[PDB]
């Protein structure tokens, strides 16, 4: 039993329903159905639209060479790296068990 | 530890080894050390090599591992040698390496060949405690042989008892004093707290009763 599974069993956290965990959501502003993640997911919104406004302080603190069109991919890679770090720790502990 | 007591012990050791009882072979003077206030089972095991002022071991053999120029230098120096092609014909043979380590008591290898020792002979010599001493192409081979002969080690094993061949009866009293004092000072310098970690010191010959210093 993994760390999340043990924590959820201790805290009474129910597994999500298959309708709740679908990769689908309704965007009101466009009036369209879009995906939460994946190809053209909602987590990468505005990475390909023609105009993004940027903060002056954010551009001042931004390192040279980096653009605003990769910030969401950077955040996604950070979350994905943390996810496999946790997954590999769980796999190693299960292998020791 | 003072002067005159150890001098008297050395004089009595020489008197017993020369006049009271003399064997048919040259005896070897050894120092045996017990250690207190320290335990190797929970701290780091130290190591160290020191060059004694006089060659303590006269009856030992040295194996030289090198190329043809090293073999030529060895035959000029009067020391046996064996080559890298013989290393490949050995090829990590455990029985042959065991027999070589039991026969030869010291090893010297060149700097252009010491990189191949773990590849061809493995960790057998390091396990046996006779890992070869590196020698460069410009170093004097006779001087390196003398340094290896006079060099003794104080590596800390898993037990408290330690032994170092500090000299021989064929030396003189002053040279035996020099060897014993340098060995004791090097052991004290290796120890973290000096004389506080020294448990007991004992000097004897090969066929002689012991004498206690500490």
């Amino acid at each position: 039993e993994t760390k999340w599974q043990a924590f959820a069993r201790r805290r009474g956290i129910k597994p999500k329903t298959r309708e709740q965990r679908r990769n689908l959501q309704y965007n009101p502003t466009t009036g369209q159905w879009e995906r939460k993640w994946g190809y053209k997911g909602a987590n990468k919104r505005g990475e390909t639209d023609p105009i993004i406004e940027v903060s002056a302080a954010k551009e001042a603190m931004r390192p040279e060479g980096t653009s605003v069109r990769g910030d969401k991919r950077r955040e996604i890679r950070a979350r994905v790296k943390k996810n496999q770090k946790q997954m590999l720790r769980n796999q190693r502990i299960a292998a020791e068990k | 530890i003072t002067v005159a007591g150890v001098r008297q012990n050395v004089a009595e050791l020489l008197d017993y080894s020369n006049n009271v009882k003399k064997r048919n072979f040259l005896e070897t003077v050894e120092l045996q050390i017990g250690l207190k206030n320290y335990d190797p089972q929970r701290d780091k095991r130290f190591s160290g090599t020191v060059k004694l002022p006089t060659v303590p071991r006269p009856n030992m053999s040295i194996c030289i591992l090198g190329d043809q120029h090293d073999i030529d230098r060895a035959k000029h120096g009067g020391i046996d040698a064996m080559s890298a092609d013989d290393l490949k014909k050995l090829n990590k043979n455990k029985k042959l390496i065991k027999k070589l380590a039991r026969k030869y008591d010291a090893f010297i290898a060149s700097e252009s060949l010491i990189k191949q020792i773990p590849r061809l002979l493995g960790p057998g010599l390091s396990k046996a405690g006779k890992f070869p001493t590196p020698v460069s192409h410009s170093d004097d081979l006779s001087a390196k042989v003398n340094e290896v002969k006079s060099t003794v080690k104080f590596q800390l094993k898993k037990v408290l008892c330690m032994g170092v061949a500090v000299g021989n009866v064929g030396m003189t009293q002053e040279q035996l004093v020099a060897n014993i004092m340098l060995a004791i000072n090097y052991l004290v310098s290796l120890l973290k707290k000096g004389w506080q970690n020294v448990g007991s010191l004992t000097i004897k010959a090969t066929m002689s009763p012991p004498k206690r210093l500490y």
Binding site: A6, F7, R10, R11, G12 | -
Partner: protein, 62 residues
């Protein structure tokens, strides 16, 4: 003994340190019991000083 504090009770029961808890858990109350009894207490909106609803009640989401 060990102590009648809640920290001592958790250490005696062998709970995982750093776990979240619901406000009101004690020796007699588990999380499920606390939620069940707080159902009976819920039903009142959050208001400001002039009686305007700033947060609606449960299932009254506006």
């Amino acid at each position: 003994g060990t102590g009648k504090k809640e920290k001592n009770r958790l250490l005696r029961e062998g709970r995982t340190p750093g776990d979240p808890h619901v406000k009101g858990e004690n020796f007699y109350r588990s999380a499920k019991k606390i939620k069940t009894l707080n159902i009976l207490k819920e039903g009142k909106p959050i208001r400001d000083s002039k009686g305007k609803i700033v947060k609606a009640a449960s299932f009254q989401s506006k």
